[PDB]
UniProtKB/Swiss-Prot annotation, chains A, B:
Species of provenance: Methanocaldococcus jannaschii (strain ATCC 43067 / DSM 2661 / JAL-1 / JCM 10045 / NBRC 100440) (Methanococcus jannaschii)
Binding site for substrate: E45, L70, A71, H72, G73, I74, H75
Catalytic activity: Co-sirohydrochlorin + 2 H(+) = sirohydrochlorin + Co(2+); Ni-sirohydrochlorin + 2 H(+) = sirohydrochlorin + Ni(2+)
Lineage of origin: Archaea, Methanobacteriati, Methanobacteriota, Methanomada group, Methanococci
Single GO molecular function: sirohydrochlorin cobaltochelatase activity
First-level EC class: lyase
Residues annotated for Ni(2+) binding in this entry: H9, H75
GO biological process: anaerobic cobalamin biosynthetic process; methanogenesis
Pathway(s) this gene product operates in, as recorded in its UniProt entry: Cofactor biosynthesis; adenosylcobalamin biosynthesis; cob(II)yrinate a,c-diamide from sirohydrochlorin (anaerobic route): step 1/10
Function: Catalyzes the insertion of Co(2+) into sirohydrochlorin as part of the anaerobic pathway to cobalamin biosynthesis. Involved in the biosynthesis of the unique nickel-containing tetrapyrrole coenzyme F430, the prosthetic group of methyl-coenzyme M reductase (MCR), which plays a key role in methanogenesis and anaerobic methane oxidation. Catalyzes the insertion of Ni(2+) into sirohydrochlorin to yield Ni-sirohydrochlorin.
Family: Belongs to the CbiX family. CbiXS subfamily.
Protein name per UniProt: Sirohydrochlorin cobaltochelatase
Keywords, alphabetical: Cobalamin biosynthesis, Cobalt, Lyase, Metal-binding, Methanogenesis, Nickel
Length: 122, 122
C-alpha cells in the first residue's frame, strides 16, 4: 500500500547507482517495506519517473520518496519535486495516489560517526 | 600534528556549506582532533587549498582529508586528488607534509538507518 522509492543524483561513473542498489538491498533485508524501488535523476536507469510508475504498477497508493543526498541542492528543491509533479512545471501523472517527499540526510550524528570512522581508515 | 579536513561539493545554494559547517562543529565537540577545517570544492569559501594551507599554518604534518560525499564521483577521483597534488596534473604545494586522502561515505548501514528514519518523517 506504501512504496519506498530511493532517489539519487546518478552519474556517468557507476558508483552512484551501485550505491542506491546496495542501499535498496539493505532496506529490503530489514523487511520493513512492501515495495522498494530506486531511481536516478540523470544518465542512469531506472529514472525517477520509471521508479515511481514501477511502484504504482505494484499497487502502491502512498509512495514515500527519499532523496539520498547529503545536502539540499537544486536537484532536491526544483528538479525532483518537478519530476514528481509536486510543483507546477517528461512529466509523470499518478492516479489518486499521493507522493510523499521526504527530507535529505543532513547533519545527522550517524554521519559524523561515519566521518570519524572514515578518517581512521575504518 | 594531524589535521582533519572535511571536504564537500559546494553549491550556489548555502545548504551544502552549512552542512559541512555543522559537521565540523560536531566533530570539534567529540574532542578527537587537534585541528579541524572544512573546504568546498566549488562556489564557496573556504576552498580545499585554503583549508589545506590553513591546516599547515597551524602546524599539521599529517593532513587527513575526508570527502563528505556519498558516492565516488568524478570530483572524488579526479578533481580533489588533483587539488591535493596526489595525481600528476591553482595548485597546492605542501612542504614534507603528507596528505592522507580517505574514502567517501558509501553504503554504510548507518546511512540505511538514517534513510529508514527519513522515510518515516523522523
Ligand atoms: Co547535479
Ligand atoms: Co559536481
Amino acid at each position: 500500500m506504501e512504496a519506498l522509492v530511493l532517489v539519487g543524483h546518478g552519474s556517468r561513473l557507476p558508483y552512484s547507482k551501485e550505491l542506491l542498489v546496495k542501499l535498496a538491498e539493505k532496506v529490503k533485508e530489514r523487511n520493513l517495506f512492501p515495495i522498494v524501488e530506486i531511481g536516478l535523476m540523470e544518465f542512469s536507469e531506472p529514472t525517477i519517473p520509471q521508479a515511481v510508475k514501477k511502484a504504482i504498477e505494484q499497487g502502491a497508493k502512498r509512495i514515500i520518496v527519499v532523496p539520498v543526498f547529503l545536502a539540499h541542492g537544486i536537484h532536491t528543491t526544483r528538479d525532483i519535486p518537478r519530476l514528481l509533479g509536486l510543483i507546477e512545471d517528461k512529466l509523470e501523472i499518478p492516479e489518486d495516489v499521493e507522493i510523499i517527499y521526504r527530507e535529505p540526510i543532513g547533519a545527522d550524528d550517524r554521519i559524523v560517526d561515519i566521518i570519524i570512522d572514515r578518517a581512521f581508515g575504518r
